[PDB]
């Protein structure tokens, strides 16, 4: 993604060492998981709430006439 090869050897392989594992991507990291669960629900609260894996179909209405 970026450069220097001895330092980046330490890091760029460590980009993908994380990705070079995917059940806990050499660490998902319990803290990451915990705060993730916090923000993911809290995000949900900060969102609109009508389930995000469901289609909001239509509604119908009838306007004032005298």
Q: Which residues bind another protein (CB under 8 A)?
A: 42, 46, 52-53, 66
Q: Min. distance of Cβ 63 from another protein in angstroms?
A: 8
Report d(CA 48, CA 63) in Å as an integer.
Answer: 27
Instruction: Quote the least distance from Cβ 13 to another protein, whole Å.
Output: 26
23 or 52, CB closer to another protein?
Answer: 52
CB of 6 or CB of 64, closer to another protein: 64
Compute, in degrees rounded to 10, the torsion defined by CA atoms 37, 40, 43, 48.
-130
Q: Are 32 and 40 in contact (CB under 8 A)?
A: no
């Amino acid at each position: 993604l970026d450069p220097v090869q001895k330092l980046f050897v330490d890091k760029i392989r460590e980009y993908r060492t994380k990705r070079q594992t995917s059940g806990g991507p050499v660490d998902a990291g319990p803290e990451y998981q915990q705060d993730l669960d916090r923000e993911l629900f809290k995000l949900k609260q900060m969102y609109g709430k009508a389930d995000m894996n469901t289609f909001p179909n239509f509604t119908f209405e009838d306007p004032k006439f005298e």
